[PDB]
């Protein structure tokens, strides 16, 4: 079960250096012993090996410089979880400390002097080209500009923000996954020996990295707010790291014309793994050119820095705020539907959030979570998960072909997940969760059976003080059965699950102090999409479709969208008095 991992993007691979990640409860002594063992084993095979770093505090393992010939031997080692080949990363009131993993910084620049601390942590790869020389250059530019965007006196977002610099990107703005990993370990060791809310800005990106995402998840679980650039490759950000880590706040870049940023032939990364977008074109900030100089830059780094700033401001006001609460407020205070989605590839539009970060001017906050596409297999499933602190209040599904078996809100590892099931002959499906933060919530999913008899049809939260937040429907007839057109369960009251008689129904029932929910609906006879929205003050919790004819239904902020090929959109709107 010991696996080997390498970058998908061949030019970004760095063979010879490997990250050996050991099993969960492996202690420091066991990492050292395993490293000494690898070295001794290699030496017997007549190979020189060098242990560069022994990871502890963040994840268990070590960093090793060795021939790839020795991989097969290192996978046979005890306690080994997996081995990941190192690869390149590229440059893109209370005291809140903001860590910056980037290039060097001009700490004496008037814009950021006395607010920026240089940690002395430096871990960078050597520059490409046998005759490369920095010369009059201080390899300051990027980092200096980004500290300016975050905390700069005249052009900064969070002017009252303490910052700490870690040199992780060389003169050519290049770093390694291994160097970043060491940087992150330094941040965790720092917070272990120190008190204070933390924000970590990672304005860099490389190809999907299992270990980078793992280290990022570990830090996030330790209550650290990690903000990252989505990537400047006009591509699915899920293919990139730390971009792909769900725990990190992933930021895409937009220009003044509310358009996604174009960077030459490429531009801002898009899709599912992008949490939100922020100003990222022609961004004025400090210039390493002089102590009083400015420069306008572009890229998802600039955009990430804005969010790191907004995070710092929110945390200076309420330092106790959780990463869940912060992400929900970040989404909440954003500008909705401003972005022109035309620039993104058609199939990625649905998955790309239409939010631009903005500062804020007993609440129920919700966010939509899109799953990855399932396979084309008839038994294939898609799964959308919430954050540990959140509640799965609703679960929907969407297929481009419309061949769907429906969806389920099922517990998986003691936590409710939104699982969507593909159908016989279907392209594949997406699972769309609605992840919420509801104050003193006691929530449960009750499962109702298919109802083909006359009566027993009405699925609702029959419990006193328990209110319906959302409904899921799963088609209960097997593929080798006899297909008959699905019949709808009659409607009596509004506050009941809309569904087919032949389907099982999963009802989310929440009990909370001042929770009140309502059902809104809107139908059109011959549409491509039907829509219904929750009023100002109300939060969309559930989104469902009344009528195969329908491709699916999904939440788009406080709007329930039903996509068709009368078509009704059924929404549950909640609020907390």
């Amino acid at each position, epitope marked *: 079960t010991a696996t080997f991992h390498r970058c998908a993007k061949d030019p970004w691979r760095l063979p010879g250096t490997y990250v050996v990640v050991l099993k969960e409860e492996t202690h420091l002594s066991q990492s050292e012993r395993t490293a000494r063992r690898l070295q001794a084993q290699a030496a017997r095979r007549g190979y020189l090996t060098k242990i560069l770093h022994v990871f502890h505090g963040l994840l268990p393992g070590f960093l090793v410089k060795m021939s790839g010939d020795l991989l097969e031997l290192a996978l046979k080692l005890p306690h080994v979880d997996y081995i990941e080949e190192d690869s390149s990363v590229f440059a893109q009131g209370s005291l809140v400390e903001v860590y910056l993993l980037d290039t060097s910084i001009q700490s004496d620049h008037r814009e950021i002097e006395g607010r920026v601390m240089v940690t002395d942590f430096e871990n960078v790869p050597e520059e490409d080209g046998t005759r490369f020389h920095r010369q009059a250059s201080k390899c300051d530019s990027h980092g200096t500009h980004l500290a300016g965007v975050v905390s700069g006196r005249d052009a900064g977002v969070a002017k009252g923000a303490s910052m700490r610099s870690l040199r992780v990107l060389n003169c050519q703005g290049k770093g390694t996954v291994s160097g970043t990993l060491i940087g992150l370990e330094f941040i965790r060791k720092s917070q272990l020996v120190q008190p204070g809310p933390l924000v970590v800005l990672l304005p860099l990106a490389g190809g999907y990295s299992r270990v980078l995402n793992a280290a990022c998840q570990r830090l996030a679980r330790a209550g650290v707010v990690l903000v990252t650039a989505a990537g400047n490759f006009r591509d699915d950000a899920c293919l990139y790291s730390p971009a792909s880590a769900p725990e990190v706040i992933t930021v895409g870049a937009t220009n003044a014309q509310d358009q996604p940023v174009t960077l030459g032939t490429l531009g801002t990364n898009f899709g599912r793994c992008v949490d939100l977008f922020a100003p990222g074109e022609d961004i004025i900030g400090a210039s390493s050119d002089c102590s009083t100089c400015f420069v306008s830059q572009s890229g998802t780094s600039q955009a990430a820095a804005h969010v790191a700033g907004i995070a710092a401001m929110m945390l200076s006001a309420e330092p106790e705020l959780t990463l869940a609460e912060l992400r929900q407020r970040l989404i909440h205070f954003s500008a909705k539907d401003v972005i022109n989605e035309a620039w993104f590839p058609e199939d990625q539009r649905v998955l790309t959030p239409n939010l631009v970060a903005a500062l804020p001017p007993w609440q129920l906050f919700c966010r939509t979570v899109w799953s990855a596409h399932s396979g084309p297999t008839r038994m294939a499933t898609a799964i959308a998960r919430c954050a540990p602190d959140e509640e799965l209040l609703s679960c929907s599904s969407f297929s481009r072909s419309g061949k769907r078996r429906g969806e389920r809100m099922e517990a998986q590892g003691g936590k409710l997940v939104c699982r969507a099931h593909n159908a016989f002959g279907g392209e594949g499906v997406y699972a769309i969760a609605r992840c919420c933060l509801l104050p003193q919530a*006691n929530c*449960s*999913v*009750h*499962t*109702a*059976p*298919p*109802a*083909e*008899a006359s*009566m*027993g*049809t*009405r*699925v*609702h939260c*029959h*419990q*006193q003080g*328990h209110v319906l937040t959302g409904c899921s429907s799963h088609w*209960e*007839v*097997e593929d080798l*059965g006899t297909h008959k057109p699905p019949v709808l369960r*009659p409607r*009596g009251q509004p506050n009941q699950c809309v569904g087919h008689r*032949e389907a*099982s*129904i999963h009802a989310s*029932c929440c*009990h909370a102090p001042g929770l009140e929910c309502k059902v809104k609906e809107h139908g059109i006879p011959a549409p491509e999409q039907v829509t219904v929205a929750c009023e100002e003050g109300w939060t969309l919790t559930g989104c469902s479709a009344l009528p195969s004819h329908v491709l699916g239904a999904y939440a788009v902020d406080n709007t329930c969208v039903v996509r068709s090929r009368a078509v009704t959109a059924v929404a549950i709107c909640c609020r907390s008095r």
Partner: antibody, heavy 124, light 108 residues
Framework: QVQLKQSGAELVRPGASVKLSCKAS????????INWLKKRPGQGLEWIAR????????YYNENFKDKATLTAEKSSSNVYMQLSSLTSEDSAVYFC?????????????????WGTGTTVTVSS | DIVMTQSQKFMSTSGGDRVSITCKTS??????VAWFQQKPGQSPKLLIY???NRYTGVSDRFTGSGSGTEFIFTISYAQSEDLADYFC?????????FGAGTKLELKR
């Protein structure tokens, strides 16, 4: 006169299969859901699956999906439950039961009539 | 899956006239709890439905109470004729889950 007659006790070799029967009478067969329930000596009843005769559509407990198969014969007026690849863990008393609905709510029903059970002995 | 935790013995109260059993649920099932009598080699008999409603023919000596996660089943003036196993079940969520059963014991 509303009743559910269950088949006789069965002895099955481990790895074999059994088709249990539940003869319904004194009511409209195709209009009421019928359920299968497992009872082990010290344990509480386990809900296996339900079938609506009339459509023959089934809903199972995930835990019994591969084990059990429900079927209905309108002519014979009886529901069947087939249990595949038996084990000593399947030696139990199987009970048959009708759901009688009194309202539109999914909780406006009860198990008014039951069969006396069929004893299954999985042994060589 | 909702967990049903039924009391192992009947609890005597007012001079042995009322004997009771509690049935506690893993999650709030509202009032969706039924109570059955089971005499050995016989089909279970519905006594209380919807936590407190008494099925047809059922004696006024059988009572049910409770809502949410705690439900009581009581037998006033228990007779030798009432010696059987008693069990509860929730019907708020599928898969349906049942209590282990409690055998009535009587002093004499």
């Amino acid at each position: 006169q509303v009743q559910l007659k269950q088949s006789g006790a069965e002895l099955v070799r481990p790895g074999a299969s059994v088709k249990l029967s539940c003869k319904a009478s004194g009511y409209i067969f195709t209009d009421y859901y019928i359920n299968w329930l497992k009872k082990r000596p010290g344990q509480g009843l386990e809900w296996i699956a339900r079938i609506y005769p009339g459509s023959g559509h089934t809903y199972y407990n995930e835990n019994f999906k591969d084990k059990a198969t429900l079927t209905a014969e309108k002519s014979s007026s009886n529901v069947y439950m087939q249990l595949s690849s038996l084990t000593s863990e399947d030696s139990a008393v199987y009970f048959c039961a009708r759901e009688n609905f009194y309202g539109s709510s999914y909780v406006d029903w009860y198990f008014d009539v039951w069969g006396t059970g069929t004893t299954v002995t999985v042994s060589s | 899956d909702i967990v049903m935790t039924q009391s192992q013995k009947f609890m005597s109260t007012s001079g042995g006239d009322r004997v009771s059993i509690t049935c506690k649920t893993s999650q709030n099932v509202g009032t969706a709890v039924a109570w059955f009598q089971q005499k050995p080699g016989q089909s279970p008999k519905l006594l209380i439905y919807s936590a407190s409603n008494r099925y047809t023919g059922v004696s006024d000596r059988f009572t049910g109470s409770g809502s949410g996660t705690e439900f009581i089943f009581t037998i006033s003036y228990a007779q030798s004729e009432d010696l059987a196993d008693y069990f509860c079940h929730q019907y708020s969520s599928y898969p349906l889950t049942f209590g282990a059963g409690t055998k009535l014991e009587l002093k004499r």
